[PDB]
Amino acid sequence: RLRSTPQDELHDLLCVGFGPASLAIAIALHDALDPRLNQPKICFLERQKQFAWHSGMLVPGSKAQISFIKDLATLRDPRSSFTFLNYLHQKGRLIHFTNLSTFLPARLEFEDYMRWCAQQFSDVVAYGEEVVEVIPGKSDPSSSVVDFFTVRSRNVETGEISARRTRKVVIAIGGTAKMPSGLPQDPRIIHSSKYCTTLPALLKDKSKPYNIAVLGSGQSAAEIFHDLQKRYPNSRTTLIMRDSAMRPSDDSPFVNEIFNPERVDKFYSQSAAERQRSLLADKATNYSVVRLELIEEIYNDMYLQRVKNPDETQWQHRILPERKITRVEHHGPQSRMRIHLKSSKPKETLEVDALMVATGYNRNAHERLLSKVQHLRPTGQDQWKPHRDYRVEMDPSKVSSEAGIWLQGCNERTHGLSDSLLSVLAVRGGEMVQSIFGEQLE
Amino acid sequence: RLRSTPQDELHDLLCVGFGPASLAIAIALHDALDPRLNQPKICFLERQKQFAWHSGMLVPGSKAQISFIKDLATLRDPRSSFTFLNYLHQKGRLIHFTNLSTFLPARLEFEDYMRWCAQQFSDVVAYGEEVVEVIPGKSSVVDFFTVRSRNVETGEISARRTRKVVIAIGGTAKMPSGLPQDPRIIHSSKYCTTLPALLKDKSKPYNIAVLGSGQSAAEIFHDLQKRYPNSRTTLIMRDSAMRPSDDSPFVNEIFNPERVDKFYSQSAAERQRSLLADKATNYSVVRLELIEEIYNDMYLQRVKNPDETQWQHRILPERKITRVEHHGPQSRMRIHLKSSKPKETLEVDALMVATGYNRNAHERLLSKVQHLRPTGQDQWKPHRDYRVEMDPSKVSSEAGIWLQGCNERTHGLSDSLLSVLAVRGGEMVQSIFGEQLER
Amino acid sequence: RLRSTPQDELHDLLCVGFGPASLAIAIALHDALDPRLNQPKICFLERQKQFAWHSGMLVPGSKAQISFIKDLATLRDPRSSFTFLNYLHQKGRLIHFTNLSTFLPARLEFEDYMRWCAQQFSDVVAYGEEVVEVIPGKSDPSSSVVDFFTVRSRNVETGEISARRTRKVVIAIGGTAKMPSGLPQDPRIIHSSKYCTTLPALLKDKSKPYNIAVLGSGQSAAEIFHDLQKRYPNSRTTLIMRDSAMRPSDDSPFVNEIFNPERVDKFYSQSAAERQRSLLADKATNYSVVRLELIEEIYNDMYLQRVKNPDETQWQHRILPERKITRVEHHGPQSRMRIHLKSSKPETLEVDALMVATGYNRNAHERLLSKVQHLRPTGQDQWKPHRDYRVEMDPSKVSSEAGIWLQGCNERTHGLSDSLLSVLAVRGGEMVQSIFGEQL
Amino acid sequence: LRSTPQDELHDLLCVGFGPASLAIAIALHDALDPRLNQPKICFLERQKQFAWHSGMLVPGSKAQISFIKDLATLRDPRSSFTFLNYLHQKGRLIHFTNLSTFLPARLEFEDYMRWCAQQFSDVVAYGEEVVEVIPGKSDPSSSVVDFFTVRSRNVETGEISARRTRKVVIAIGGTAKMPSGLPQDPRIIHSSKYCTTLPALLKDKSKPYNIAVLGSGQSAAEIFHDLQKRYPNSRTTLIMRDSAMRPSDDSPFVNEIFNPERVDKFYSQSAAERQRSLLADKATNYSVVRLELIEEIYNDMYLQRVKNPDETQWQHRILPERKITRVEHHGPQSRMRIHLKSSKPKETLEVDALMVATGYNRNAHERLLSKVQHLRPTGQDQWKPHRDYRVEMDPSKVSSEAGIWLQGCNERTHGLSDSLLSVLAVRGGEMVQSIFGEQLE
């Protein structure tokens, strides 16, 4: 029902990335066009070759960390055909999911749900295209204002650069792997985001006695550490964390009301200081914390080792708390790197075949992608500043009001902790369609 | 969308009862007429003064016993505007329910959801109307029916004519035989409505007994201890213990909508064997969490006094009532108990009788048309699409009677529940209005 | 502490079997002898080479099915040195177990607890001894009265027969594998009791796409079916059950009071008709049922196959309900047997192994005592235990100071707890008073 | 354990007979028991019998410790003072087993400890409120203090009596912490006196009282939840300066800080490391609520929303991010007027009672020891307990046979478990060794 736009025509909207955030916009646009519920020239560019939701971390048994009611449509309109329940119905799996009695689908299943949603937009999604730059465009070269943008993308397979012109741009590119600055670059040092996809290529013998270290103590680290013990049953795994313990995520109901869609207005209207203080107070809802059930499972596995041998130093799988990595030796043809550990308080060494670095993500890559348009920001800004409707501030003497750039998923500091999650995507997709296409549709 | 039909015209369909079962049919009819998703002369008669879902058993804290996904539309079409989630959304309560993390809404909430659904059919529902007779209408062929109802407020008898009749009247209170008639002997279905009128002083040390060991008995026994803090309650059961309901996932696939075809297609012997094999999913069983809470309350009494006979609240297992003696409202009733194997006397202010329900009241209601059944039948026989067998030499092809909610023997344990209402509603609309709608 | 008796001497008590039931008797006799809580010529004969608790079913992740308070001593005396909590304390593990917040230890752990208890009685337990018969003894050439028994056992390693004389015998030999009669004998057909110990030797390549069927739908079937899926991650497993579904065990509190030690008195005093009707009413506590958590786990694995493929005939792991095996072709050099399946209401599989999880019988004491069954009173075809677990003997034939007790095979007279760990602590205490009371 | 005449020189006098002092009595009994392995000992307790926070024994409240952490098991599971042995003596062991819970009702755990305490009745004097600890010199002309005189007030008569002892244990728990700007008024009641004092004030269970609760930790949540059941027609208001009730951390790795053997590890860290560690782990106990109770309160709120979507009209409300700026409480009117402002760096409530669930202080031992604090080493203004809980004394002023020990107020040096039931069994054994080790050997 959403038709393609010729690559070389002037688009109304180009979205960089086709993860859940952009997909929720495609769904909301489809729904806003659906006569049952209530065409712009739109495309989406995605570097991956097909839709995939953190495929590097699709570990067996991993569960979504959101109730399925927070899918890409229900909180905006439960009648939408893009709800998780309607997806199940179309797959003939609705009653079977009902008998599961869980709000938390397997990540594999929620990925498939979103894949099923995305498949209905394949005519307007360009996969295998990595946006590399956004550059100013002027319909009249001697005009003093930019009135469109040219987005250049690199073909992930051939490296060819393609160009699309558009009035409006959405940046919804998720996060980039955050790595500790003192770790060297090495094929054996692998960020959590590439665990399932690259670690098997590196360590091909599942039964070989590898020594595998995991750095971190949030959800990525816990899932990898737990999974490694099953994926390489004879390995020796070491969880290295600078905290004293894995800590539980806060799933409690009053605290989690910060994720309600209608809280975005209130959070945004707060002073930067109150926003800073609020984000700090609620950081334990998602960051550096592990779902209690997974902590308890790991704790149980540790206990079973203790039953077999009371000396923890002799355990197959170990946790080294309050440690930090001070040096990595990684040169020469040998298989193992040497990891140097010191206390994380204000030496030990491990020989490892691979280091999984589960140290989280940054959400600042939009600043790099937009560097060739950052001269259009108002003087005195060194970061893009989104308004309540996610449109970034532009110097009006330099940019036409009909052109604009919106950010999605990197606005935690202005819009709250729900900004990078699935939590408010259904509602926000509806807001973005109104903001970007409201006049056009009316 | 569904418009009234004048009281005197020949209706296409008249449904007796407007509980969840008839409501699901109205919803599916609405949805089949809704252009987003893809008029017959229909009305409903309901004895209660408004839609109400077992209002006598709306005890504080009671939860519906079905995942909300099994609401009145979602399993048929999750896009329907009559889903529970859409209901929550229209109330501005969707996110708040989400933060609850339960599939099992409070019964008060699920009633309100269904009441919200029912309010959309107010033009075609006549409340406060108790159907009393279904009369043959006419050659020697019966081709319509007259449904007579008594107004609960005025007692006036009204007649409505219809080609087709749906009987969806739920169940009637099953009482142990031989009980005297006494207003203080109260079936569980009237607990919230009759006991507070009878026992008005919440702080008085009443003696209150409860008969039974299913979900109704447990809920009443647990609730009495909070409603009458100073009461002495006694749970009388002929089994040895409250037993947990089976919510295990493979067993509970018997409630799937698509199992109705498979169950129906079995022999009567296999259907009987199946119903007995799965009886622990719902009958004479208690949700484990409630069993454990009652058990904890009992243990705490043991902490205060090791002598169980001196407890405020007691359970008398493996007992049956041999008689309830009364000497007038001047004094307490005397309950005589003996072992239920193939003794005690209790003096009580009230007896709550939580002994379940029968689902055969339709045979009385249809007695004046039972001569239209095929010779040699003493019970109405519903087919897979719920239409009862009629002697075709006596009844026209344009007329018929359907039963809903009383067909466990032919359609499985889900028949009397909410479990398959969304899907069954769609089937009923097809079977009843399919041709009409295709034209 | 418990000192050995010279093997050729006349013992006060010989217990056949050193599983938890005999062990609980050893522990209770130790405690009765400790002046700090409050010696007979006692010995135990055990077939296995060391103490082991259903080692053939020590499946990874398996948990005990009793609260640890129901251990071998606590319910009789929480001060006993043989409580699970003291065992943990002696191991330096008490605080660490406490942080688990569970009442159900891993079976591997509970076995090690009982093994730790057992090792304290090594002086009176002879391992590797399979008792083969109990023969009557008449110490008076004039009197025709049996006043002792000679228990003969076959040494598992040497096959040599040895004889021990005792006034009193306890038979505590647990259960024998119950196999469907129509099933042929074949090395690829293994009872669940030999799963961990026999199946790996038969199916040695953990990564081969084997076809493995499991017969049954109780706790053993579910544990094996779920375990096979991790052990042989490429196998195609099939759960064959004659019921329509796996059904949850009843762990609800009022029902499980049937397992209370003080209930044995009330159960025993009932008519055989009521005791039969009671056992059938409460069979769901533990027979032909699966702990709910494990049912849901299996169901979730099944659901995940449905996500990837809607057609269940094509799943890697399948459940076939309401089926019975009518025939198993197993002759031939072919690696796989052919299981023929019909409906169980009143298709063929090609498999490399059939795990048979069809439960146990507790009738083996009948063969062991055949050479003394003539000492029973006239008109009994079964041994009839009294409340104190002593079997009835014709008093004109057996001296009062001689007797035979049965342990763990008395469900019919003593309740569903009889074969479990449930009342072992208290029953041990009663057995020591029944057997050694007068002597103490 | 047999009585020592009040006027004799004791070996040990314990101030308080709560769980901490009882753990020492139990460990002394066990050390004296030949099955497991007399000093002149005396306990002084203000209450008339053993009682474990009886002011907060609200219906349904649970102990927040696995029963394995009782007063003896972690030191010796064979002790007759274990929780399981108590159940066995009550004829209740199997029944508790069928509960499948590690967390007894507070009522039950209190009864267990009362059952333990009754076996020490000969050495506990109830109804005695200790008021001061005074230096003693068996030779008044000498310059060294070699005993202490403990003075207590009889609660019934008010008479002071004196007991002399070589060694003193202070194990007095905590005192109610009140916000300083709140006035003193019979309608303003600390959570510790909820069950004992609020019913006396509000006698009519059916009256539609307006009752506010200040705070958002476990006491505030338990009271807020209880009031809705005790006064079914009341309007209750939970006033908190946080934005939400937050869950307590019961995850297993974090909760290893409560292990007995971790006391050595915590104590052996630098003061800065101890401060940082205590702050990191505050969510295990302080200003947090057991998740299950939070979920129950949230569900009760949800039901109100079903009946009426406008939260201002709800019977029971939560006012987050608020602070009390003024209380009007003079005049004959029954209700006080509470003034609220944002807690961020006008609105009024009229209430019949304000329950103040703002926690406890643990400095009351400093008052009791004021008349001996000149015996500390020069340059100390706070008591410094060593690893074995004995406070530092100037050795040139105090004899080695005299000493003062503290229990339950030593979080800063010994960890979060110090004020709880967590390490009492093991610590009792350590305290018996330190105080009576030579004497018993």
Ligand SMILES: Cc1cc2nc3c(=O)[nH]c(=O)nc-3n(C[C@H](O)[C@H](O)[C@H](O)COP(=O)(O)OP(=O)(O)OC[C@H]3O[C@@H](n4cnc5c(N)ncnc54)[C@H](O)[C@@H]3O)c2cc1C
């Ligand atoms: C393993 C895991 C880790 C998580 N970590 C975090 C986190 O640190 N913080 C947090 O609040 N949420 C995190 N979440 C929750 C997560 O953010 C949401 O589930 C969801 O992925 C957000 O959708 P999004 O579309 O904004 O981002 P994504 O799901 O990341 O989608 C972004 C898309 O943009 C594409 N893309 C990126 N760059 C380019 C480019 N230059 N050109 C073209 N396409 C591009 C990517 O391929 C990707 O498909 C995590 C979830 C998982 C499963």
Ligand SMILES: Cc1cc2nc3c(=O)[nH]c(=O)nc-3n(C[C@H](O)[C@H](O)[C@H](O)COP(=O)(O)OP(=O)(O)OC[C@H]3O[C@@H](n4cnc5c(N)ncnc54)[C@H](O)[C@@H]3O)c2cc1C
């Ligand atoms: C407290 C409680 C007890 C339950 N007990 C049972 C049970 O024993 N067995 C079981 O399988 N299910 C039982 N259920 C599940 C229950 O049947 C379903 O939740 C649901 O009510 C079935 O809907 P229904 O419309 O088929 O019947 P009902 O909900 O009972 O609705 C039937 C309607 O018909 C009306 N009516 C009856 N007679 C007449 C008449 N002569 N004229 C006009 N109107 C009439 C009634 O007023 C009622 O509104 C129970 C549920 C609850 C909450």
Ligand SMILES: Cc1cc2nc3c(=O)[nH]c(=O)nc-3n(C[C@H](O)[C@H](O)[C@H](O)COP(=O)(O)OP(=O)(O)OC[C@H]3O[C@@H](n4cnc5c(N)ncnc54)[C@H](O)[C@@H]3O)c2cc1C
């Ligand atoms: C995997 C598993 C399966 C179970 N299946 C059942 C069941 O089907 N039914 C049921 O009611 N309970 C069953 N249980 C519960 C079980 O019976 C108790 O946990 C407990 O093992 C009973 O102790 P017992 O000593 O009476 O028997 P066991 O633990 O069986 O001990 C019997 C001992 O006697 C030995 N022995 C046997 N014959 C001889 C002989 N001729 N000579 C010398 N020694 C001999 C055996 O080697 C064994 O060591 C099962 C438990 C588990 C863990």
Ligand SMILES: Cc1cc2nc3c(=O)[nH]c(=O)nc-3n(C[C@H](O)[C@H](O)[C@H](O)COP(=O)(O)OP(=O)(O)OC[C@H]3O[C@@H](n4cnc5c(N)ncnc54)[C@H](O)[C@@H]3O)c2cc1C
């Ligand atoms: C409702 C509740 C609130 C709690 N609040 C806290 C808290 O804010 N912070 C925290 O870390 N722990 C708290 N806890 C945990 C608690 O400290 C332990 O459960 C346990 O009470 C500690 O025992 P204790 O004997 O050290 O103190 P207590 O149980 O308080 O015992 C101290 C005893 O000393 C007596 N006493 C006090 N002064 C004198 C005197 N001058 N003379 C004679 N006797 C005296 C008291 O009567 C009391 O019996 C709380 C527990 C509950 C149930």
Ligand SMILES: NC(=O)c1ccc[n+]([C@@H]2O[C@H](COP(=O)([O-])OP(=O)(O)OC[C@H]3O[C@@H](n4cnc5c(N)ncnc54)[C@H](OP(=O)(O)O)[C@@H]3O)[C@@H](O)[C@H]2O)c1
């Ligand atoms: N919150 C809810 O949604 C809710 C609430 C209540 C009920 N329900 C459901 O409605 C259905 C009916 O449940 P129910 O508890 O009302 O009834 P029920 O399941 O039919 O149980 C009836 C109880 O009464 C006993 N009984 C029947 N006749 C008796 C007699 N003459 N003498 C003594 N005892 C007698 C029965 O004993 P026996 O056990 O010996 O047969 C049984 O214990 C159930 O499926 C239930 O789950 C749901």
Ligand SMILES: [Ca+2]
């Ligand atoms: Ca939650």
Ligand SMILES: [Ca+2]
């Ligand atoms: Ca239980």
